[PDB]
Amino acid sequence: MKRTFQPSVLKRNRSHGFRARMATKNGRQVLARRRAKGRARLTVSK
Template identity: 65%
Template structure:
């Protein structure tokens, strides 16, 4: 059996990175919510 989770930084960044979030309306809402909450890091990558 192969492992189900094989992390890759670039792939992750393209999916859930800052620029990916800014590209969609929903993503911008996520960033706005995290800013309002006062998160130190807006995106996990």
């Protein structure tokens, strides 16, 4: 039974990585929101 999550570091970084968020303004707002909440992990860091 193949499950939904099939890990891949390259796909994870290129999809939800820090640079991916900064590319668009919506991603920048995502980072801004999580800085405000004080989350330790801003994004998925390798």
